Design an enzyme around this catalytic site. Structure first.
Site, PDB file in Angstrom:
ATOM      1  N   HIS A  74      16.406  57.224  33.199  1.00  0.00           N
ATOM      2  CA  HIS A  74      15.935  56.121  34.799  1.00  0.00           C
ATOM      3  C   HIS A  74      15.193  56.775  35.696  1.00  0.00           C
ATOM      4  O   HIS A  74      16.191  57.429  36.604  1.00  0.00           O
ATOM      5  CB  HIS A  74      17.313  55.160  34.270  1.00  0.00           C
ATOM      6  CG  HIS A  74      16.483  53.983  35.472  1.00  0.00           C
ATOM      7  ND1 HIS A  74      15.474  53.048  34.443  1.00  0.00           N
ATOM      8  CD2 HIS A  74      16.738  53.477  36.510  1.00  0.00           C
ATOM      9  CE1 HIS A  74      15.315  52.433  35.399  1.00  0.00           C
ATOM     10  NE2 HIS A  74      15.990  52.085  36.527  1.00  0.00           N
ATOM     11  N   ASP A  95      12.945  55.811  38.665  1.00  0.00           N
ATOM     12  CA  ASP A  95      12.698  55.080  39.602  1.00  0.00           C
ATOM     13  C   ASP A  95      10.802  54.995  39.827  1.00  0.00           C
ATOM     14  O   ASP A  95      11.025  56.665  40.973  1.00  0.00           O
ATOM     15  CB  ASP A  95      13.306  54.382  40.340  1.00  0.00           C
ATOM     16  CG  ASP A  95      15.064  53.971  39.943  1.00  0.00           C
ATOM     17  OD1 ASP A  95      14.523  52.752  39.185  1.00  0.00           O
ATOM     18  OD2 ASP A  95      15.526  54.291  40.123  1.00  0.00           O
ATOM     19  N   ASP A 131      17.557  47.999  33.989  1.00  0.00           N
ATOM     20  CA  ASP A 131      17.273  47.335  35.632  1.00  0.00           C
ATOM     21  C   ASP A 131      16.690  46.315  35.939  1.00  0.00           C
ATOM     22  O   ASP A 131      17.535  46.315  37.083  1.00  0.00           O
ATOM     23  CB  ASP A 131      17.489  48.917  35.921  1.00  0.00           C
ATOM     24  CG  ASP A 131      17.801  48.984  37.747  1.00  0.00           C
ATOM     25  OD1 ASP A 131      19.183  48.604  36.642  1.00  0.00           O
ATOM     26  OD2 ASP A 131      18.085  49.804  38.375  1.00  0.00           O
ATOM     27  N   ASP A 157      20.456  57.391  35.750  1.00  0.00           N
ATOM     28  CA  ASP A 157      19.534  58.261  37.222  1.00  0.00           C
ATOM     29  C   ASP A 157      19.208  58.857  37.687  1.00  0.00           C
ATOM     30  O   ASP A 157      20.548  60.046  37.454  1.00  0.00           O
ATOM     31  CB  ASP A 157      19.836  57.077  38.519  1.00  0.00           C
ATOM     32  CG  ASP A 157      20.149  55.618  38.465  1.00  0.00           C
ATOM     33  OD1 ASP A 157      19.560  54.886  37.057  1.00  0.00           O
ATOM     34  OD2 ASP A 157      20.146  54.892  39.379  1.00  0.00           O
ATOM     35  N   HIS A 207      10.663  47.942  39.593  1.00  0.00           N
ATOM     36  CA  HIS A 207      12.080  46.433  39.977  1.00  0.00           C
ATOM     37  C   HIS A 207      12.583  47.171  41.680  1.00  0.00           C
ATOM     38  O   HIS A 207      13.493  46.313  41.742  1.00  0.00           O
ATOM     39  CB  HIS A 207      12.351  46.665  38.414  1.00  0.00           C
ATOM     40  CG  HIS A 207      13.606  48.091  38.835  1.00  0.00           C
ATOM     41  ND1 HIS A 207      12.444  48.347  37.509  1.00  0.00           N
ATOM     42  CD2 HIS A 207      14.383  48.453  39.044  1.00  0.00           C
ATOM     43  CE1 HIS A 207      13.212  50.009  37.796  1.00  0.00           C
ATOM     44  NE2 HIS A 207      14.311  49.904  38.254  1.00  0.00           N
TER      45      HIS A 207
END
Ligand SMILES: CC(C)(C)c1ccc(CC[C@@H]2CC[C@@H](O)[C@@H]3[C@H](O)[C@H](O)CN23)cc1
Ligand SMILES: [Zn+2]
EC number: 3.2.1.114
Length: 1016
Positions: A61, A63, A175, A312, A442
């Site tokens: 994951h 971001d 998420d 993550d 997000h």
């Protein structure tokens, strides 16, 4: 032909509002599965002729900004993850990996040498590396506008088609903080077949798991037939990490995350570590793992099981790839050779999982339930409801909506022509689309990133706004100059944009004054653009250096105008009052512009030595004790003063509004004879708890109902004009303004929460409408969903996203509040609406951000307030889960989100100027919009292609007779059409070749895309 979206209540197995009404939401200790129960299974369910097929799906994951910026994460983590994925997948043909965030993938791929690009294409083509969703980001689903969800999806998928030759049909959303049906709506119209979600309320996971309803066909709330349905998998447990993805017991699952043995600086909170798999322990380890898998499998209907394996920024180091792969390979070899387990386990991808599920379904092994509704408001545990992020960092939430409109206007204005490469049009538009797309993340629009990351997003969006301005003003110059005179310098500023509401009065001094004078310049051309596909009138205003200015159109016809002062509000640190000061050299001129569909209109402002025949001047009244003079230079009317008092105003033949002595609305009277309906604005404050969990960027945990803001004796300014009137008041933390132009008022709040720690400021409307426990809020600016207040849930659970509007109604009366920015809100008592303005929080709320929210800055929030009689409207029945706007409320929303654009000519004389563009464009029915117009080809293409997204909303029938309008055929907007095709919404697949090259209009609540091809 078209489905009726009002009168037919869909029959579904699960309807989320009905489910909410029935559920008890008890938070009981379920054992090792803390929010579930002790799962039991029959070991004899699986046998030689019926095995459990297990797909272990490795993932990472990533971001695009959160605790670090996009570029910081790329340099420190993501570039290493992707480089090592390429090497390890190349070298280990049975290993698999899924990837979601195309912003990072594109950043990486373009820096690769050709040899490695080829290696990367090969592991995608052979199915080892699989893209899931394929958007630029994994977007927020609460605050995002559907237009920007589509924009970012298209940006990622267009990149993937061009460079990787693939288009994902399965979506992965692990998420975002709660989930919206806008996602399956867009995905299903973009070729998708399957989607996966994770963050739903723990009580919902328990209820659906008990009924094996975690896989469902998710249709829209108004869809009777089911043509919108998309197969959806909801994950069952508390998180997407390895401890919460193998099965119900995280103490066990943690032992199968082989990164947690110590050398990587990670451990298991449940105090039992992973152990390396060996021949001496593999039987016992397999016993434990298969038991977890068979428990998870009890929650679902087929013999195919999904086991995500990731967290993550995982799969970063070479040694990590090895430790996960080798240990899982030893487990698979043992399990798959021991007949007594009746399991076949392997590494897989997301699409492989869904393909196997549907093979089982077609074999008659399972049938799936139907579902409609949404998954807000999310709680992950106890009373921790994630309604705070509906408001956090509201400056950037407002900026999102401004940039949304600037991107649409820049793409539309520049689509009309083909541009030489030297003009850098495609370059600037790609930059603007990518920065806006990034912010849909997000941790972007949600307001949940660290301060320096919020600054990076802001800087990126400011560059995107400048790019849009450049493209728009070059396009206006080309569209409105005689072709044989047009002489562009592609670096020059022919026009500057004028925006009255961003950053806004009291936020930034950003607007240019038009400088006129007998000894410098007698007149100035201005141009308005209307992105909507119908004729539109709207008041527009400019700053000018004299009050003696008159307006003409480009046939030299006089246009009625009003001049008002320029007022700015100041917190006077000496007198300890908040009061307005007027300019003695700048003035506002206001007039009605009339602009063609998707078109342009030119006007002229001319100075004179005295008051012009067709220009009037507003009166101004300052209400306060202890007034002092307010000089206004050449302005022809003296300011008047008085003690605070109630007042009433009416512009045109519109409503009459009454205000309290504190400058706040108290009543609305719709017509001459009608009742003064009580409608009261009030500002209140929420605080934070002194013990237990604290509110932060994510969580709203109030210390009880809100308390009124103490107002003192505030200063009130009343401006009364023929075209525009207003009442403005300086309250603590808010300059509140009500503006009247002859229809529903506009509300503006300049919100500066200052140093008020642990405070949330709310704006409430109090009415006597008998709404009971029902209210309506929108989802992504696309649809209105019915809400029911539930006193069995805490206050913060009854807060919902307000991405564009909300309303309450009874049998006779409706009040609708439309917004120019996403914020959080509710109806906490019959007759009330409320919406949060800003929040300043000292504490971290334990979701990983590691800071409070203490970086507030002044923001100008904008609204329209529409009071209407609805007794004559044809509304859905009491059991229908949707609601619909009236014509007036929909037009009010469009006035906030897609206003006229204003351009000021930058030099002294515009040689070859023309008066109008688009007068021959069709004026389409009011419920239809051209959401996107985008040229898809560069100038070297023999066959030019232009893409259009067409959206039709659904407006209530209330007895206003229909006037004929013109059919809009987007395929004939540009000349020399050779082909018209219906496409997916991303423009990437042709679905229908259209007869006569005519693009049909769409049904209510439907969205379609068309591409026209033109011989050049
Ligand atoms: C208890 C700690 C370790 C702080 C923790 C709290 C929450 C989570 C869930 C994952 C969170 C949810 C909020 C969200 O902002 C972040 C980022 O987008 C990142 O991808 C992990 N996400 C994971 C871990
Ligand atoms: Zn995340």
């Amino acid at each position: 032909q078209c489905q009726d979206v009002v009168q037919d209540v869909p029959n579904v197995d699960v309807q989320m509002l009905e489910l909410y009404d029935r559920m008890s939401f008890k938070d009981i200790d379920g054992g090792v599965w803390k929010q579930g129960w002790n799962i039991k299974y029959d070991p004899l369910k699986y046998n030689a002729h019926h095995k459990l097929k297990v797909f272990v799906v490795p993932h990472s994951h990533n971001d695009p900004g959160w605790i670090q910026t996009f570029e910081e994460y790329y340099q420190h983590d993501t570039k290493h993850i992707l480089s090592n994925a390429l090497r390890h997948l190349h070298d280990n043909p049975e290993m698999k990996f899924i990837w979601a965030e195309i912003s990072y993938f594109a950043r990486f791929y373009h820096d690769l040498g050709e040899n490695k690009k080829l290696q990367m294409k090969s592991i995608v083509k052979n199915g080892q590396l699989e893209f899931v969703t394929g958007g630029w980001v994994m977007p927020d689903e609460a605050n995002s506008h559907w237009r920007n969800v589509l924009l970012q999806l298209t940006e990622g998928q267009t990149w993937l088609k061009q460079f990787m030759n693939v288009t994902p049909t399965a979506s992965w959303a692990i998420d975002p903080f709660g989930h919206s049906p806008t996602m399956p709506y867009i995905l299903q119209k973009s070729g998708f077949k399957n989607m996966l979600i994770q963050r739903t309320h723990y009580s919902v996971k328990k209820e659906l798991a008990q009924q094996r309803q975690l896989e469902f066909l998710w249709r829209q709330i108004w869809d009777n037939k089911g043509d919108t349905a998309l197969f959806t998998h909801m994950m069952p447990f508390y998180s997407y990490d390895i401890p919460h993805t193998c099965g119900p017991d995280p103490k066990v699952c943690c032992q199968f995350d082989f990164k947690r043995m110590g050398s990587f600086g990670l451990s298991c909170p449940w105090k039992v570590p992973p152990r390396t798999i060996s021949d001496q322990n593999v039987a016992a380890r397999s016993d434990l793992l298969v038991d977890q898998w068979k428990k998870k499998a009890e929650l679902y209907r087929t013999n195919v099981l999904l086991i995500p394996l990731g967290d993550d920024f995982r799969f970063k180091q070479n040694t990590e790839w090895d430790v996960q792969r080798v240990n899982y390979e030893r487990l698979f070899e043992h399990i798959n050779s021991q007949a007594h387990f009746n399991v076949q386990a392997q590494f897989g991808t997301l699409q492989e999982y869904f393909d196997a599920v549907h093979q089982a379904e077609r074999a008659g092994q399972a049938e799936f339930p139907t579902l409609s509704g949404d998954f807000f408001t999310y709680a992950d545990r106890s009373d921790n409801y994630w309604s705070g992020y509906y408001t956090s960092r509201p400056y950037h939430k407002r900026m999102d909506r401004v940039l949304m409109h600037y991107v649409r206007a820049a793409e539309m204005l520049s689509a009309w022509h083909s541009w030489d490469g030297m003009a850098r049009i495609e370059e600037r538009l790609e930059q603007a689309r990518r920065e806006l797309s990034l912010f849909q993340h997000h941790d972007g629009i949600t307001g949940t990133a660290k301060t320096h990351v919020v600054v990076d997003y802001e800087q990126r969006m400011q560059e995107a706004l400048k790019a849009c301005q450049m493209v728009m003003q070059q396009s206006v110059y080309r569209l409105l100059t005689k072709p044989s005179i047009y002489s562009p310098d592609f670096s020059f500023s022919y026009f500057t944009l004028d925006d009255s509401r961003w950053p806004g009065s009291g936020v930034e001094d950003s607007r240019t004054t038009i400088i006129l004078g007998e000894d410098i310049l007698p007149s100035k051309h201005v141009v308005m653009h209307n992105t909507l596909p119908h004729w539109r009138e709207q008041l527009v205003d400019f700053y000018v250096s004299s009050p003696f200015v008159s307006v003409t159109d480009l046939a030299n016809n006089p246009v009625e105008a009003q001049v008002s002062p320029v007022w700015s509000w100041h917190h006077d640190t000496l007198t300890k009052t908040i009061h307005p000061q007027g300019s003695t050299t700048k003035y506002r001129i206001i007039f009605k512009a009339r602009v063609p569909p998707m078109g342009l209109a030119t006007y002229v402002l001319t100075i004179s030595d005295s008051k012009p025949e067709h220009t009037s001047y507003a009166s101004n009244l300052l209400l306060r004790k202890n007034p002092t003079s307010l000089p206004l230079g050449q302005y022809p009317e003296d300011v008047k003063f008085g003690d605070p008092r109630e007042i009433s105003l009416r512009v045109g033949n519109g409503p009459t509004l009454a205000f309290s002595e504190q400058g706040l609305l108290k009543s609305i009277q719709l017509t001459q004879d009608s009742p003064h309906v009580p409608v009261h604005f009030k500002f209140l404050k929420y605080g934070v708890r002194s013990h237990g969990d604290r509110s932060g960027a994510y969580l709203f945990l109030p210390n009880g109902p809100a308390s009124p803001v103490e107002l003192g004796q505030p200063v009130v300014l009343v401006t009364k004009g023929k075209l525009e009137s207003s009442v403005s008041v300086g309250l603590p933390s808010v300059v509140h303004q009500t503006i009247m132009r002859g229809g529903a008022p506009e509300i503006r709040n300049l919100v500066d929460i200052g140093s008020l720690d642990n405070t949330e400021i709310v704006m409430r409307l109090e009415t006597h409408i008998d709404s009971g426990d029902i209210f309506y809020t929108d989802l992504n600016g696309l649809q209105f969903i019915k809400r029911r207040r539930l006193d069995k849930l805490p206050l913060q659970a009854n807060y919902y996203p307000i991405p564009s509007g909300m309303f309450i109604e009874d049998a006779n009366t409706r009040l609708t509040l439309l917004t120019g920015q996403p914020l959080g809100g509710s109806s906490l008592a019959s007759g009330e609406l409320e919406i949060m303005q800003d929040r300043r929080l000292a504490s971290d709320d334990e979701r990983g951000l590691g800071q409070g929210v203490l970086d507030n800055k002044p923001v100008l929030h904008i609204y329209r307030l529409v009071l209407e009689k609805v007794n004559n409207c044809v509304r859905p029945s009491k059991l229908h889960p949707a609601g619909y706007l009236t014509s007036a409320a929909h037009k009010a929303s469009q006035s906030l989100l897609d206003p006229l654009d204003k351009f000021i000519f930058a030099e002294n004389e515009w040689i070859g100027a023309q008066g109008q563009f688009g007068g021959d464009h069709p004026s389409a029915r009011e419920d239809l919009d051209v959401s996107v117009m985008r040229r898809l080809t560069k100038s070297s293409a023999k066959t030019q292609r232009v893409g259009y997204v067409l959206h039709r909303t659904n407006l209530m029938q209330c007895g206003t007779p229909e006037e004929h309008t013109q059919k809009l055929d987007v395929c004939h907007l540009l000349p020399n059409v050779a082909r018209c095709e219906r496409t997916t919404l991303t423009f990437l697949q042709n679905l229908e070749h259209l007869d006569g090259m005519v693009a049909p209009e769409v049904c209510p609540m439907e969205t379609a895309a068309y591409v026209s091809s033109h011989s050049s």
